[PDB]
Amino acid sequence: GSHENKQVEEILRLEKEIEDLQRMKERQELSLTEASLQKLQLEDKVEELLSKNYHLENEVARLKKLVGE
Amino acid sequence: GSHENKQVEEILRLEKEIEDLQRMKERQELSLTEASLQKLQLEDKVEELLSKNYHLENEVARLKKLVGE
Numbered sequence: 001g002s003h004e005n006k007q008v009e010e011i012l013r014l015e016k017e018i019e020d021l022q023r024m025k026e027r028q029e030l031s032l033t034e035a036s037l038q039k040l041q042l043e044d045k046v047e048e049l050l051s052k053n054y055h056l057e058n059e060v061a062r063l064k065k066l067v068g069e
Numbered sequence: 070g071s072h073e074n075k076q077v078e079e080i081l082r083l084e085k086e087i088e089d090l091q092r093m094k095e096r097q098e099l100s101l102t103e104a105s106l107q108k109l110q111l112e113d114k115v116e117e118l119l120s121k122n123y124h125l126e127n128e129v130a131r132l133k134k135l136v137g138e
Contacts, residue, residue, distance in 0.1 A: 011136045014129045028115045060083045067080045
């Protein structure tokens with residue numbers, strides 16, 4: 001068992017640990033990107049549903065008035 | 070069974086169905102609000118972790134050079 005193994009082994013540990021942290025930072029950044037994209041997707045769904053809801057809202061709202069709003 | 074029940078019953082159905090759609094629109098809007106808030110939370114975690122990672126990055130990076138970068 002060479003003594004230098006300590007230095008080689010020491011760095012090896014740092015690479016493994018650092019690599020883990022590096023991925024954690026990158027993974028989080030990816031989540032933010034996906035989060036933003038997900039939000040836009042909701043806008044599309046909400047936009048269409050909101051528009052449709054409004055159309056029906058007028059239809060039902062009109063009928064509601066007959067009974068008593 | 071009064072005939073008018075049809076009108077009363079008709080509106081009742083509309084209120085239940087419309088109410089469901091109304092909540093769906095509001096629920097989605099809430100999701101967007103929470104989504105944005107969640108993103109900021111990630112910034113705080115990433116910001117701190119990123120800063121700490123950088124500090125360690127210099128420490129380990131410096132050591133890596135001794136072995137061979």
